[PDB]
């Protein structure tokens, strides 16, 4: 009778929860735990995204306002990673003095709720640091000399800091000049909800950088905002988000227990069948449960990081987002296993998974041509094409070219002053596009004439 | 003999109007009613579009002129949903005073036929409203205080409104300042047709908005134009368009009667055949007639809305256009049924409609991956990529990426200051593009090796 | 013996010139006439293109210089079909007076070889014309009043034209103000070849246009350049190009005779075979010769027009180019018949021409959906999308969308202030792209499963 | 026994190095020489690219700084191949005088480490050369007259060079004005590595060019930088790169010997088999070795050029890069032969190489249509479309259009003032896109229905 019982076991282990009900009126409480998971995880992700949008928008808007306030002649768009640049000694002096003077008159210039903030030394003021190579008989060591400009120093009607010997810069040895100050703001765009607003501290540094010593000073504006508590303020949910994140951890933990239970019990059924087969003489793994386990672990980790961020009021959510997003993605891929319970969501799998070896072998072959073209393009067209500046950019450009993106712009971007490089670029681009189109279309006719045989043999 | 008669019925019910003439010299007056419909509906749509183009062009040109007249330092292009922005208290004051002074001197500045218009209170003048949080000890309530600047007030050679206590703004509590005025224009670009021109009333509001309190005031210019009747004017078709719209309603109503008649009579023939089949023991629906009925209803509704708009001289035609366009689209799809009467416009239908279940099943599976990628991309790359700002934008970006659009720009838009987010973005984009290309090409080889069998079985 | 002779005829009429030599050592002097044609026609086209490039470049460079000289605050790029625009009465006055003053001081401002040219009335000077509606009690008639500003009038140290009653404009009735003057230039960039340079006459008109009466004056600069003969000039091939064009006409005329001879003689062989077939009881046309005849006619016409243009020194070559280009295109298509003489350049024709009926039938069906979408998109998204402004633009946008071009930009271009139009635009774009991708891929699986059968039956 | 020995020979000559070990425990020291080659060649290329990036970045940054210092009103972006342009005599004078005055005050304007450099005549100063047509009674000869402006000449408090008769230019005869000067810089961005920095000499020429005589002067800034040795400098690997390049030459020379040895020995085995076949009565070439030999030759040549460049301190690496890149590309293609030793990386070759004749025949046919369209588009749309300016640009535009790139932009770029050219452009673009899409999809259905038969016959 043990053979019949074993056969009934697997006959029950291989059917969908919808059917298992038909066979035994059983309730898949585990499938329910999964629907409640998809709803709770998606809800948490959306709420987290909305709150992050609000905070990030406030910080970025304040940064743009600061750039307009303190950078002289700021266009409104960052030239590069740096905001603006100067090419003349008098331009650099004007930018430095403009930043200092705008800080002096902040209360009459700012449109928002800004005030001066105490520095790390507990004093309202401005710090300017400059670095020079010590001394063309320059040395290799750098000299760092700074002074602290208090509000009393700036407020003197005859300004003495402008005429001081500090601000003679000797630009041929100058490495950089750095201006640091702190500002305190408030977002009143939160009081219309009877919730006390969040006071912010801004640590702004302006760096006038000429490490390159190429005749251009690059001006970087960096604003680091952190959420302090409000001290001087009188007008007229923390546990809620935390309980929700704790429930999410409970559901994704319960799912983690159940899936690991099923995998362990699946290994037990293998023994019985394997031992039974021995006497007379990955399918059991169900690698969707691997995906579910990974997504549960990632959701638990991301929820813990989110709780930690909310608890201590921290504003960088990059790694918390990378866990929650990559776990929600896997949750929706797990919806496909449930969808992949009706027989109709199959039959094309006999090609979608069977072609995978052929495609992966093709990728290995085409990968070597792709690497060779990447190296060639970087070395040759690097100094003449902005899409070939570095190896990673070359790889992205070649990937996009394989997909038809910006071909004419790619051809036209390279100037014709160097005739040899122009001819080589033409040959390079034409050969790459033609060769890869040919290879992709070939791979493909083959994949077809193979499936044809595969499906013929299957029937 | 009833069997023969029934057989002759269906033998007549299944043939084209061109053939039914061969079988009985009958005139398909109903097919004629359809050609006259396609011509009348298309003609009405084109005439409506041309007239709307004229009116909208006049209104938009006047709005651009107003923005140049009243917005200080207007570039010519709206920065965003708002036209321009300021970052300094003195800039905001300059913009406000510039708007007021330009309104004061309108007659000497405008190039067109503009004049002052009476307000809702029947008085030529300018209204300025400002909103402040009541009182950092601010309250949660807002205070709205306004004054009306008449032309006599502005025309005083010593201006007293500039120095009044109204225009001290206390920007840290300011929510917005709003300027409202009315102008009356004429389009003389209609007199060259001996048709009396249309006098317009413009309700212009300039909103200096800093609800965000982020250090930037956004300046919105909104112009609401309505067509009044001309009062002061002496120089040297309404029924026509209305009769045409009424004829359109008659033709699309007659077609509605005939199609509903045929469907009802089609149900009668089903009874006869079904009862006949019972004794010895959607095709009849002709779902093209469903399309014709829907298009007729939409055309009647759109024509009624068009008549209502023309009757009371109203200038917003968004919903009238959405009915007429979506009905003309369905009319041209109904041309395909007539085209689909020759046998040659078939045979490919045996795949165009048979593949539909497989494609729809594929869309269900790929839809879950698409949703997962949408959520992941929004949560991770949202704060760093302008094409991932919100969920709808992420969905559009992913759809476009599946079609090869702006891949290199999408890769390059994300800055590399955050290395973790940069690496994740690279992995995300590469995986999405590769996976979806693989899935689409797979779906496809399958659809082929299936049709092959389907067409083989058919023959 | 007549049967054998007839059979030998066709056996000779159906072989390639290369083979006919193998069968009879015959020289295809006619195939030679064709190679000399491809070389002579291509050479003529290239020479014509180079000379046109030179002339057009000179004229366009002079036009750009004129725009910088006479248009106040010209950016360097035309805003639209018009060069620049103004929105204030004082701006319009400044532009008009700037143009007049720059003309007054031309000799000291121009960098090239420019001088004043006599007008149609044989007098060096400037003409200003203005148009007003006669007289709000305006009439429907226009009044045209002008004055001629001579160089003596402009050179008076107290300028009287500025203060004259002519230049009070009454902008509310103004239609346009037009400034006309003539300049004479020389291209010294032709003397370095010992060829006397070409003196030009420029007829420049500046139109300050406000027909719209929308508060914007559009400023058009139109320069009409014609090649006069040089009068005042002393420094230190016309028959050649003409003889070459005459030889081209001879070769394309000889080819026209021979092809028409062969077609006529081909009809003779049809009679013999057709009569022979009758006794016991397009292939002969060779529609490549139709292409050759059309290309010969077009080349002769284009060469005649080119000779006419060169003879009387005229500078508009639009229709001459459209004949020469479209004839050279057909000449290269005729190279394919010669290439299509080896057997290997066939066998794929059994699908390239057999699929044509199925594709054309598909285009008829998809054409109706394309027209419906064009009308719907124009009527709905016309006032909100710059790619849907008019019907032709909508058709081009839909064609490009079918090919994957600017999808994200097309989605993003439409603003979200109108929620109904935004939702409809999303539905419209998604449905169009999905439907047309589906239809194209379907047409295609069908074309395959058909060729498969076609090629199977062929063997 | 010689038959058995011969059979054993080939049985050994046709197996992979991995297997030959299974058959004889032999060590493929030659395959090792290949892995060490791929690592050494890639390493050399990467190091060369990084060093070139540094040098080129320094030179380009200095050039941008020079353009900002010496070009009046420089925007920051080159208008074209030329940096900026002027259209007025006074603008040209201002630009010339601005360049001279900025050179005079260089020490107080430059941000980097710049100084005056001696000219070719060993004297610090500025040279201005102007060219005029000799003398409208101009001649054909040019007159070149120049003066040398020393620092003493520029430093005189009353400037005499401004008022000299040299700088009256007579613009109607002017060909160009050229300003030449030398500057000496240092990159201190190399001292932070205890490596003495590289002093540079810059040969800057500013050319005010109006060869066109079209009313625009084009201003070219050309900076030629060469690495001199440092003379005045006191602060606080050449053999390494050279030994590495010499080792690379040894490995790519040893590989060249071995591959040529194998090819020669391969020809010996052909004799034995061919003679053996005679008695009773490219595969042997292994054209991968041709690729290896070519890549070895290119690597040796590129390494020699790199050694020559490093030895004499020269900064143009265009041809050295074109050899190293195109050799590294071939090295990665040679990785595919090793990958193509497992049987699985085959079977698709039976189509990837068999389709090549059909595709090449298709390219020959489609090439003639492509050439015809190129000529037609250039001749017609050349003067109206910036993507059709010259034949090469037309070819690139058509290639991109075949791949779906910028279709709507291509359609929209051509203005509608000329209706005939607009209609022809529409017809041209539509016909090209439709025809080439049709031909590519046809080629393709054929390639499939052929492989099907090919693979069927193979089995
Ligand atoms: C071996 O690569 C191919 C693979 C598959 C088909 C064709 C090619 N050929 C044809 C040309 N190249 C194609 C690359 C991708 C699409 C654009 C080009 N097709 S084209 O416009 O019709 C054309 C044809 C002949 C001459 C000039 C242009 C690449 C080589
Ligand atoms: C499983 O997805 C695929 C599905 C079908 C074909 C290929 C792939 N592979 C190949 C690479 N990816 C392709 C995505 C769409 C087109 C661009 C890429 N083709 S490629 O340039 O020739 C290439 C090949 C190897 C390495 C690097 C680049 C995605 C994975
Ligand atoms: C009936 O049209 C189709 C025809 C052929 C294949 C697929 C579709 N479907 C699938 C979606 N649409 C495709 C249109 C062209 C390519 C982009 C879309 N493919 S997708 O990114 O993979 C995707 C899949 C599911 C949901 C969301 C996105 C259109 C409908
Ligand atoms: C003989 O060329 C073809 C080859 C293969 C398929 C179709 C065509 N046809 C169809 C139209 N043209 C297609 C070219 C490439 C893709 C865009 C066009 N397809 S479409 O949007 O669906 C369409 C259909 C009918 C009318 C209007 C538009 C080119 C001719």
PDB file of N, CA and C in Angstrom, chain B residues 268-333:
ATOM      1  N   UNK B 268     -33.844  37.204 -35.567  1.00  0.00           N
ATOM      2  CA  UNK B 268     -34.984  36.425 -36.038  1.00  0.00           C
ATOM      3  C   UNK B 268     -34.537  35.217 -36.847  1.00  0.00           C
ATOM      4  N   UNK B 269     -33.541  35.394 -37.719  1.00  0.00           N
ATOM      5  CA  UNK B 269     -33.060  34.280 -38.531  1.00  0.00           C
ATOM      6  C   UNK B 269     -32.384  33.225 -37.669  1.00  0.00           C
ATOM      7  N   UNK B 270     -31.767  33.638 -36.563  1.00  0.00           N
ATOM      8  CA  UNK B 270     -31.189  32.669 -35.640  1.00  0.00           C
ATOM      9  C   UNK B 270     -32.261  31.742 -35.083  1.00  0.00           C
ATOM     10  N   UNK B 271     -33.403  32.306 -34.678  1.00  0.00           N
ATOM     11  CA  UNK B 271     -34.504  31.498 -34.160  1.00  0.00           C
ATOM     12  C   UNK B 271     -34.912  30.418 -35.150  1.00  0.00           C
ATOM     13  N   UNK B 272     -35.177  30.820 -36.393  1.00  0.00           N
ATOM     14  CA  UNK B 272     -35.600  29.882 -37.427  1.00  0.00           C
ATOM     15  C   UNK B 272     -34.598  28.744 -37.596  1.00  0.00           C
ATOM     16  N   UNK B 273     -33.322  29.086 -37.782  1.00  0.00           N
ATOM     17  CA  UNK B 273     -32.298  28.054 -37.901  1.00  0.00           C
ATOM     18  C   UNK B 273     -32.168  27.243 -36.618  1.00  0.00           C
ATOM     19  N   UNK B 274     -32.169  27.910 -35.461  1.00  0.00           N
ATOM     20  CA  UNK B 274     -32.007  27.187 -34.203  1.00  0.00           C
ATOM     21  C   UNK B 274     -33.182  26.251 -33.953  1.00  0.00           C
ATOM     22  N   UNK B 275     -34.406  26.716 -34.216  1.00  0.00           N
ATOM     23  CA  UNK B 275     -35.566  25.846 -34.065  1.00  0.00           C
ATOM     24  C   UNK B 275     -35.543  24.712 -35.083  1.00  0.00           C
ATOM     25  N   UNK B 276     -35.137  25.007 -36.321  1.00  0.00           N
ATOM     26  CA  UNK B 276     -35.039  23.967 -37.342  1.00  0.00           C
ATOM     27  C   UNK B 276     -34.018  22.909 -36.946  1.00  0.00           C
ATOM     28  N   UNK B 277     -32.882  23.338 -36.392  1.00  0.00           N
ATOM     29  CA  UNK B 277     -31.868  22.395 -35.934  1.00  0.00           C
ATOM     30  C   UNK B 277     -32.368  21.557 -34.766  1.00  0.00           C
ATOM     31  N   UNK B 278     -33.179  22.148 -33.887  1.00  0.00           N
ATOM     32  CA  UNK B 278     -33.712  21.414 -32.744  1.00  0.00           C
ATOM     33  C   UNK B 278     -34.633  20.284 -33.196  1.00  0.00           C
ATOM     34  N   UNK B 279     -35.421  20.519 -34.247  1.00  0.00           N
ATOM     35  CA  UNK B 279     -36.377  19.514 -34.708  1.00  0.00           C
ATOM     36  C   UNK B 279     -35.696  18.194 -35.049  1.00  0.00           C
ATOM     37  N   UNK B 280     -34.655  18.243 -35.872  1.00  0.00           N
ATOM     38  CA  UNK B 280     -33.938  17.045 -36.293  1.00  0.00           C
ATOM     39  C   UNK B 280     -32.697  16.930 -35.419  1.00  0.00           C
ATOM     40  N   UNK B 281     -32.854  16.314 -34.256  1.00  0.00           N
ATOM     41  CA  UNK B 281     -31.774  16.200 -33.287  1.00  0.00           C
ATOM     42  C   UNK B 281     -32.238  15.366 -32.098  1.00  0.00           C
ATOM     43  N   UNK B 282     -21.980  34.608 -32.723  1.00  0.00           N
ATOM     44  CA  UNK B 282     -21.457  35.941 -32.999  1.00  0.00           C
ATOM     45  C   UNK B 282     -21.399  36.194 -34.498  1.00  0.00           C
ATOM     46  N   UNK B 283     -21.404  35.112 -35.279  1.00  0.00           N
ATOM     47  CA  UNK B 283     -21.375  35.255 -36.730  1.00  0.00           C
ATOM     48  C   UNK B 283     -22.611  35.992 -37.227  1.00  0.00           C
ATOM     49  N   UNK B 284     -23.782  35.646 -36.692  1.00  0.00           N
ATOM     50  CA  UNK B 284     -25.007  36.353 -37.046  1.00  0.00           C
ATOM     51  C   UNK B 284     -25.015  37.782 -36.513  1.00  0.00           C
ATOM     52  N   UNK B 285     -24.306  38.036 -35.411  1.00  0.00           N
ATOM     53  CA  UNK B 285     -24.305  39.365 -34.805  1.00  0.00           C
ATOM     54  C   UNK B 285     -23.676  40.387 -35.744  1.00  0.00           C
ATOM     55  N   UNK B 286     -22.587  40.011 -36.419  1.00  0.00           N
ATOM     56  CA  UNK B 286     -21.854  40.906 -37.316  1.00  0.00           C
ATOM     57  C   UNK B 286     -21.341  42.133 -36.553  1.00  0.00           C
ATOM     58  N   UNK B 287     -20.396  41.863 -35.656  1.00  0.00           N
ATOM     59  CA  UNK B 287     -19.880  42.859 -34.736  1.00  0.00           C
ATOM     60  C   UNK B 287     -19.256  44.089 -35.365  1.00  0.00           C
ATOM     61  N   UNK B 288     -19.241  44.158 -36.696  1.00  0.00           N
ATOM     62  CA  UNK B 288     -18.967  45.429 -37.354  1.00  0.00           C
ATOM     63  C   UNK B 288     -20.111  46.409 -37.136  1.00  0.00           C
ATOM     64  N   UNK B 289     -21.347  45.906 -37.110  1.00  0.00           N
ATOM     65  CA  UNK B 289     -22.488  46.767 -36.830  1.00  0.00           C
ATOM     66  C   UNK B 289     -22.420  47.343 -35.426  1.00  0.00           C
ATOM     67  N   UNK B 290     -21.783  46.637 -34.491  1.00  0.00           N
ATOM     68  CA  UNK B 290     -21.540  47.222 -33.176  1.00  0.00           C
ATOM     69  C   UNK B 290     -20.655  48.454 -33.305  1.00  0.00           C
ATOM     70  N   UNK B 291     -19.601  48.354 -34.116  1.00  0.00           N
ATOM     71  CA  UNK B 291     -18.731  49.496 -34.355  1.00  0.00           C
ATOM     72  C   UNK B 291     -19.488  50.636 -35.020  1.00  0.00           C
ATOM     73  N   UNK B 292     -20.347  50.316 -35.987  1.00  0.00           N
ATOM     74  CA  UNK B 292     -21.111  51.353 -36.676  1.00  0.00           C
ATOM     75  C   UNK B 292     -22.063  52.046 -35.711  1.00  0.00           C
ATOM     76  N   UNK B 293     -22.729  51.278 -34.849  1.00  0.00           N
ATOM     77  CA  UNK B 293     -23.647  51.861 -33.877  1.00  0.00           C
ATOM     78  C   UNK B 293     -22.899  52.771 -32.911  1.00  0.00           C
ATOM     79  N   UNK B 294     -21.741  52.322 -32.423  1.00  0.00           N
ATOM     80  CA  UNK B 294     -20.965  53.151 -31.505  1.00  0.00           C
ATOM     81  C   UNK B 294     -20.517  54.437 -32.190  1.00  0.00           C
ATOM     82  N   UNK B 295     -20.040  54.336 -33.434  1.00  0.00           N
ATOM     83  CA  UNK B 295     -19.591  55.529 -34.146  1.00  0.00           C
ATOM     84  C   UNK B 295     -20.746  56.482 -34.413  1.00  0.00           C
ATOM     85  N   UNK B 296     -21.932  55.950 -34.723  1.00  0.00           N
ATOM     86  CA  UNK B 296     -23.098  56.806 -34.919  1.00  0.00           C
ATOM     87  C   UNK B 296     -23.473  57.536 -33.639  1.00  0.00           C
ATOM     88  N   UNK B 297     -23.488  56.826 -32.510  1.00  0.00           N
ATOM     89  CA  UNK B 297     -23.800  57.477 -31.243  1.00  0.00           C
ATOM     90  C   UNK B 297     -22.792  58.575 -30.939  1.00  0.00           C
ATOM     91  N   UNK B 298     -21.505  58.281 -31.131  1.00  0.00           N
ATOM     92  CA  UNK B 298     -20.474  59.273 -30.853  1.00  0.00           C
ATOM     93  C   UNK B 298     -20.587  60.474 -31.786  1.00  0.00           C
ATOM     94  N   UNK B 299     -20.903  60.246 -33.063  1.00  0.00           N
ATOM     95  CA  UNK B 299     -21.054  61.366 -33.987  1.00  0.00           C
ATOM     96  C   UNK B 299     -22.243  62.236 -33.613  1.00  0.00           C
ATOM     97  N   UNK B 300     -23.364  61.620 -33.229  1.00  0.00           N
ATOM     98  CA  UNK B 300     -24.527  62.402 -32.817  1.00  0.00           C
ATOM     99  C   UNK B 300     -24.195  63.235 -31.586  1.00  0.00           C
ATOM    100  N   UNK B 301     -23.536  62.622 -30.599  1.00  0.00           N
ATOM    101  CA  UNK B 301     -23.187  63.341 -29.374  1.00  0.00           C
ATOM    102  C   UNK B 301     -22.241  64.495 -29.683  1.00  0.00           C
ATOM    103  N   UNK B 302     -21.220  64.236 -30.500  1.00  0.00           N
ATOM    104  CA  UNK B 302     -20.269  65.279 -30.831  1.00  0.00           C
ATOM    105  C   UNK B 302     -20.895  66.412 -31.615  1.00  0.00           C
ATOM    106  N   UNK B 303     -21.802  66.088 -32.537  1.00  0.00           N
ATOM    107  CA  UNK B 303     -22.495  67.130 -33.285  1.00  0.00           C
ATOM    108  C   UNK B 303     -23.385  67.962 -32.376  1.00  0.00           C
ATOM    109  N   UNK B 304     -24.057  67.325 -31.415  1.00  0.00           N
ATOM    110  CA  UNK B 304     -24.868  68.081 -30.463  1.00  0.00           C
ATOM    111  C   UNK B 304     -23.993  69.023 -29.646  1.00  0.00           C
ATOM    112  N   UNK B 305     -22.852  68.529 -29.161  1.00  0.00           N
ATOM    113  CA  UNK B 305     -21.951  69.387 -28.398  1.00  0.00           C
ATOM    114  C   UNK B 305     -21.413  70.527 -29.255  1.00  0.00           C
ATOM    115  N   UNK B 306     -21.130  70.255 -30.529  1.00  0.00           N
ATOM    116  CA  UNK B 306     -20.654  71.301 -31.429  1.00  0.00           C
ATOM    117  C   UNK B 306     -21.717  72.369 -31.645  1.00  0.00           C
ATOM    118  N   UNK B 307     -22.973  71.951 -31.822  1.00  0.00           N
ATOM    119  CA  UNK B 307     -24.064  72.909 -31.952  1.00  0.00           C
ATOM    120  C   UNK B 307     -24.211  73.741 -30.687  1.00  0.00           C
ATOM    121  N   UNK B 308     -24.094  73.102 -29.523  1.00  0.00           N
ATOM    122  CA  UNK B 308     -24.181  73.832 -28.264  1.00  0.00           C
ATOM    123  C   UNK B 308     -23.050  74.844 -28.130  1.00  0.00           C
ATOM    124  N   UNK B 309     -21.838  74.459 -28.527  1.00  0.00           N
ATOM    125  CA  UNK B 309     -20.697  75.365 -28.440  1.00  0.00           C
ATOM    126  C   UNK B 309     -20.885  76.557 -29.369  1.00  0.00           C
ATOM    127  N   UNK B 310     -21.287  76.303 -30.614  1.00  0.00           N
ATOM    128  CA  UNK B 310     -21.465  77.398 -31.562  1.00  0.00           C
ATOM    129  C   UNK B 310     -22.612  78.310 -31.146  1.00  0.00           C
ATOM    130  N   UNK B 311     -23.662  77.743 -30.547  1.00  0.00           N
ATOM    131  CA  UNK B 311     -24.841  78.537 -30.211  1.00  0.00           C
ATOM    132  C   UNK B 311     -24.528  79.596 -29.163  1.00  0.00           C
ATOM    133  N   UNK B 312     -23.825  79.221 -28.096  1.00  0.00           N
ATOM    134  CA  UNK B 312     -23.552  80.134 -26.995  1.00  0.00           C
ATOM    135  C   UNK B 312     -22.137  80.697 -27.023  1.00  0.00           C
ATOM    136  N   UNK B 313     -21.421  80.535 -28.135  1.00  0.00           N
ATOM    137  CA  UNK B 313     -20.106  81.146 -28.334  1.00  0.00           C
ATOM    138  C   UNK B 313     -19.082  80.733 -27.277  1.00  0.00           C
ATOM    139  N   UNK B 314     -18.906  79.420 -27.102  1.00  0.00           N
ATOM    140  CA  UNK B 314     -17.878  78.918 -26.152  1.00  0.00           C
ATOM    141  C   UNK B 314     -16.667  78.268 -26.828  1.00  0.00           C
ATOM    142  N   UNK B 315     -15.475  78.402 -26.244  1.00  0.00           N
ATOM    143  CA  UNK B 315     -14.164  78.336 -26.926  1.00  0.00           C
ATOM    144  C   UNK B 315     -13.405  77.111 -26.462  1.00  0.00           C
ATOM    145  N   UNK B 316     -13.944  76.347 -25.507  1.00  0.00           N
ATOM    146  CA  UNK B 316     -13.278  75.077 -25.106  1.00  0.00           C
ATOM    147  C   UNK B 316     -13.926  73.905 -25.842  1.00  0.00           C
ATOM    148  N   UNK B 317     -13.211  73.299 -26.790  1.00  0.00           N
ATOM    149  CA  UNK B 317     -13.793  72.220 -27.615  1.00  0.00           C
ATOM    150  C   UNK B 317     -13.123  70.875 -27.340  1.00  0.00           C
ATOM    151  N   UNK B 318     -12.604  70.634 -26.135  1.00  0.00           N
ATOM    152  CA  UNK B 318     -11.832  69.392 -25.853  1.00  0.00           C
ATOM    153  C   UNK B 318     -12.700  68.136 -25.934  1.00  0.00           C
ATOM    154  N   UNK B 319     -13.880  68.126 -25.324  1.00  0.00           N
ATOM    155  CA  UNK B 319     -14.690  66.885 -25.308  1.00  0.00           C
ATOM    156  C   UNK B 319     -15.427  66.725 -26.639  1.00  0.00           C
ATOM    157  N   UNK B 320     -15.772  67.827 -27.303  1.00  0.00           N
ATOM    158  CA  UNK B 320     -16.441  67.731 -28.623  1.00  0.00           C
ATOM    159  C   UNK B 320     -15.460  67.099 -29.604  1.00  0.00           C
ATOM    160  N   UNK B 321     -14.201  67.532 -29.580  1.00  0.00           N
ATOM    161  CA  UNK B 321     -13.149  66.960 -30.451  1.00  0.00           C
ATOM    162  C   UNK B 321     -12.932  65.475 -30.136  1.00  0.00           C
ATOM    163  N   UNK B 322     -12.934  65.092 -28.860  1.00  0.00           N
ATOM    164  CA  UNK B 322     -12.659  63.673 -28.482  1.00  0.00           C
ATOM    165  C   UNK B 322     -13.788  62.761 -28.994  1.00  0.00           C
ATOM    166  N   UNK B 323     -15.006  63.265 -29.152  1.00  0.00           N
ATOM    167  CA  UNK B 323     -16.085  62.453 -29.704  1.00  0.00           C
ATOM    168  C   UNK B 323     -16.018  62.397 -31.221  1.00  0.00           C
ATOM    169  N   UNK B 324     -15.791  63.541 -31.871  1.00  0.00           N
ATOM    170  CA  UNK B 324     -15.752  63.556 -33.330  1.00  0.00           C
ATOM    171  C   UNK B 324     -14.553  62.784 -33.867  1.00  0.00           C
ATOM    172  N   UNK B 325     -13.389  62.926 -33.235  1.00  0.00           N
ATOM    173  CA  UNK B 325     -12.218  62.201 -33.690  1.00  0.00           C
ATOM    174  C   UNK B 325     -12.361  60.702 -33.541  1.00  0.00           C
ATOM    175  N   UNK B 326     -12.822  60.281 -32.362  1.00  0.00           N
ATOM    176  CA  UNK B 326     -12.939  58.841 -32.059  1.00  0.00           C
ATOM    177  C   UNK B 326     -14.080  58.243 -32.829  1.00  0.00           C
ATOM    178  N   UNK B 327     -14.987  59.057 -33.351  1.00  0.00           N
ATOM    179  CA  UNK B 327     -16.060  58.520 -34.219  1.00  0.00           C
ATOM    180  C   UNK B 327     -15.568  58.432 -35.669  1.00  0.00           C
ATOM    181  N   UNK B 328     -14.745  59.380 -36.119  1.00  0.00           N
ATOM    182  CA  UNK B 328     -14.196  59.354 -37.484  1.00  0.00           C
ATOM    183  C   UNK B 328     -13.234  58.196 -37.594  1.00  0.00           C
ATOM    184  N   UNK B 329     -12.429  57.931 -36.571  1.00  0.00           N
ATOM    185  CA  UNK B 329     -11.562  56.759 -36.531  1.00  0.00           C
ATOM    186  C   UNK B 329     -12.365  55.478 -36.734  1.00  0.00           C
ATOM    187  N   UNK B 330     -13.480  55.343 -36.013  1.00  0.00           N
ATOM    188  CA  UNK B 330     -14.303  54.151 -36.170  1.00  0.00           C
ATOM    189  C   UNK B 330     -14.966  54.089 -37.542  1.00  0.00           C
ATOM    190  N   UNK B 331     -15.263  55.241 -38.145  1.00  0.00           N
ATOM    191  CA  UNK B 331     -15.835  55.258 -39.491  1.00  0.00           C
ATOM    192  C   UNK B 331     -14.849  54.680 -40.500  1.00  0.00           C
ATOM    193  N   UNK B 332     -13.573  55.034 -40.372  1.00  0.00           N
ATOM    194  CA  UNK B 332     -12.585  54.486 -41.299  1.00  0.00           C
ATOM    195  C   UNK B 332     -12.312  53.006 -41.023  1.00  0.00           C
ATOM    196  N   UNK B 333     -12.413  52.581 -39.762  1.00  0.00           N
ATOM    197  CA  UNK B 333     -12.358  51.139 -39.513  1.00  0.00           C
ATOM    198  C   UNK B 333     -13.554  50.419 -40.158  1.00  0.00           C
TER     199      UNK B 333
END
